[PDB]
Design an enzyme around this catalytic site. Structure first.
Site, PDB file in Angstrom:
ATOM      1  N   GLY A 105       0.812  -1.168  -0.006  1.00 13.32           N
ATOM      2  CA  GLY A 105      -0.075   0.035   0.136  1.00 13.32           C
ATOM      3  C   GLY A 105       0.899   1.279  -0.091  1.00 13.32           C
ATOM      4  O   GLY A 105       0.225   2.541  -0.426  1.00 13.32           O
ATOM      5  N   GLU A 106       2.023   1.228   0.498  1.00 13.40           N
ATOM      6  CA  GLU A 106       2.668   2.480   0.602  1.00 13.40           C
ATOM      7  C   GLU A 106       3.381   2.879  -0.577  1.00 13.40           C
ATOM      8  O   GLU A 106       4.084   2.177  -1.367  1.00 13.40           O
ATOM      9  CB  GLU A 106       3.903   2.033   1.449  1.00 13.40           C
ATOM     10  CG  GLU A 106       3.688   1.594   2.886  1.00 13.40           C
ATOM     11  CD  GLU A 106       2.952   0.309   3.657  1.00 13.40           C
ATOM     12  OE1 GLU A 106       3.203  -0.683   2.580  1.00 13.40           O
ATOM     13  OE2 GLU A 106       2.481  -0.049   4.320  1.00 13.40           O
ATOM     14  N   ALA A 107       3.198   4.090  -0.890  1.00  9.77           N
ATOM     15  CA  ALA A 107       3.574   4.802  -2.252  1.00  9.77           C
ATOM     16  C   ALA A 107       5.064   4.737  -2.322  1.00  9.77           C
ATOM     17  O   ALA A 107       5.578   4.133  -3.486  1.00  9.77           O
ATOM     18  CB  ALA A 107       3.343   6.313  -1.845  1.00  9.77           C
ATOM     19  N   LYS A 109       7.202   2.100  -1.564  1.00 13.29           N
ATOM     20  CA  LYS A 109       7.666   0.781  -1.835  1.00 13.29           C
ATOM     21  C   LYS A 109       7.221   0.382  -3.150  1.00 13.29           C
ATOM     22  O   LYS A 109       7.824  -0.065  -4.118  1.00 13.29           O
ATOM     23  CB  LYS A 109       6.542  -0.040  -0.932  1.00 13.29           C
ATOM     24  CG  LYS A 109       6.998  -0.038   0.409  1.00 13.29           C
ATOM     25  CD  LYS A 109       6.355  -0.970   1.395  1.00 13.29           C
ATOM     26  CE  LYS A 109       6.598  -0.902   3.046  1.00 13.29           C
ATOM     27  NZ  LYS A 109       7.974  -1.106   3.417  1.00 13.29           N
TER      28      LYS A 109
END
Ligand SMILES: [Mn+2]
Length: 196
Positions: A105-107, A109
């Site tokens: 979910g993390e931008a 990553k």
């Protein structure tokens, strides 16, 4: 007297255990496999294990590949290198890539995965894009389009003509083909990304 068939049976049970430990806690799973000499602690070998993916949860795979840790970064590079993108168009390649794991979910990553993808795509398909920044930008365009077209929480939907207008400039000092952009658009429009 040592019974190698016994050694194999014990090893199978341990591997099953390791997969289960991985699906809960990818770093723990990998540490267990490594400690029991079931997997070599090398980027390439760990990447091969995750690419095969046998009895592995694809969200776990993604989470492992998205750790900002030296080893995991090396694994992510090797993992993208196991993909085969030659002769594929950008959406075809993205479909292969985004089936092999579930995006975090993390931008930040996602960004590291997307950069790696774009660089590998361009190396496998020289001369499709005049730079890797172009392919990186266009890969996001395609992912965002999939979201925009197929998530109904995104109110108003981007049409072809607008997609082509946003993206035609991104190549060099001259535009791409508008053929290539229409092909990407329609592909996504007619078949969303299959995600795990
Ligand atoms: Mn369809």
């Amino acid at each position: 007297e040592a019974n190698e068939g016994s050694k194999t049976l014990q090893r199978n049970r341990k591997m099953a255990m390791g997969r289960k430990k991985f699906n809960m806690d990818p770093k723990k799973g990998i540490q267990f496999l490594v400690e029991n000499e079931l997997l070599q602690n090398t980027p390439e070998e760990i990447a091969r294990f995750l690419y095969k993916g046998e009895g592995l949860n694809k969200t776990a795979i993604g989470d492992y590949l998205g750790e900002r840790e030296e080893l995991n970064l090396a694994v992510l590079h090797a993992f993208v290198d196991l993909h085969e993108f030659t002769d594929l168009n950008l959406v075809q390649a993205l479909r292969q890539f985004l089936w092999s794991f579930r995006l975090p979910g993390e931008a930040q990553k996602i960004d590291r995965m997307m950069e790696a993808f774009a660089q590998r795509y361009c190396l496998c398909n020289p001369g499709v894009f005049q730079s890797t920044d172009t392919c990186y930008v266009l890969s996001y365009s395609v992912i965002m389009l999939n979201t925009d077209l197929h998530n109904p929480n995104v109110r108003d939907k981007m049409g072809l003509e607008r997609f082509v207008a946003m993206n035609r400039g991104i190549n060099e000092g001259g535009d791409l083909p508008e053929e290539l952009l229409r092909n990407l658009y329609d592909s996504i429009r007619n078949e969303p990304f299959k995600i795990p």
